Design a protein around this motif. Structure first.
Motif: not given
Ligand SMILES: [Zn+2]
Ligand SMILES: [Zn+2]
Ligand SMILES: [Zn+2]
Lengths: 149, 152, 159
Positions: B90, B92, B123, B125, B127, C8, C10, C48, C52, C58, C82
């Protein structure tokens, strides 16, 4: 098999007149990491990952960064978990970390009671971007995997 | 089951006169990523997560070529040779521009092909950095990766 | 056992005039996080990590950040949706770990409230949910109090 993930993050500023200690290795350099403890960004990020995987909170809840990492491994063992492995990255523009990586891995492996083959440390620069790329601080990231018994 | 975790980080500056290559996908864009290789930030972070889980060091410790898909495949071969198999990856990518979402499928298919894994174990992702810091000003692109292995 | 890792990330800016909601907890503070939804940085990063690990893409693929439906959205509702997709895809959640990084306000006193919400939302016991708090040691935009970052990791097993 009850497997659990944890992840850790730490950053400290680099300042004149402090020794640079990362992964418990003292590295010759004109500046070193500022913090309350010896500010060992790499041992702190691994300690956080380990508490995180065990859901025992964080470094601030509980607490030499070596002493702390050893007490962390005790608490994790006492909670009924075994450590599968640790992987980590230190991000520093300078100095060169490559010749000290094996020493950090040996310190970590001893403190966690692991063979060397279950401990990994990786070094990166920040490609001259940001406070890391300008040498104003050093970051570490870590991930740990536990199995609950 | 001897399961292992790995994690990877990479960042490169965006500059004119370079193609933007992420997850092996050529993305049209006025700038590209600067490095001695093709500076594919995503393939580098995944490569590092995979060596990291296998305790084989990192990309630096390894592999002189610029094409990061060739490096990702050699990574997979070293991982395999060390006795491990890959459960999943996975990741990002963080970029203020261009929009990355329409390019993600192609990165998934490149990485899946290079690691010999089905799509459902791979995967990626996308951002932004919400206009914070050098990432939020469009000055470079960061990728993060995590990989899980099982030593057989 | 078919185990899968997710991660994840953010980050959101802190601005005047928004509530500060992190991990579903309203924290008293003069500024709040700016985004399309309520900008709950910690729930977004866990959401996320969950999508993932399940290879379900996402958060933006499921809940568009320009669709009116999610303007001001309570991010717990997106987290719960989710988790249901992840379970429906055949996965059980082993655990979640996470870190929030802010120079201010102090987040450590609020960690246990965030864990409680996340555990409730994910249908997990507390002992499988962890949240850690950090500052950025006065470095960069996070060190100067301009935004708050969250990081998460999730571990699933496919049934
Ligand atoms: Zn520290
Ligand atoms: Zn790179
Ligand atoms: Zn968000």
């Amino acid at each position: 098999m009850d497997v659990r993930i944890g992840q850790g993050y730490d950053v400290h500023q680099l300042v004149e007149g402090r020794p640079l200690i990362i992964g418990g290795v003292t590295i010759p350099y004109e500046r070193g990491l500022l913090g309350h403890s010896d500010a060992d960004v790499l041992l702190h990020a691994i300690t956080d990952a380990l508490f995180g995987a065990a859901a025992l909170g964080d470094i601030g809840r509980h607490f030499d960064s070596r002493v702390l990492l050893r007490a962390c491994a005790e608490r994790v063992k006492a909670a009924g978990f075994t450590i599968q492995n640790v992987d980590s990255t230190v991000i520093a523009q300078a100095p060169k970390l490559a010749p000290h990586i094996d020493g950090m891995r040996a310190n970590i492996a001893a403190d966690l009671g692991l063979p060397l083959e279950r401990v990994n440390v990786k070094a990166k620069t920040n490609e001259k971007l940001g406070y890391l790329g300008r040498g104003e601080g050093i970051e570490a990231q870590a991930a740990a995997l536990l199995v609950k018994q």
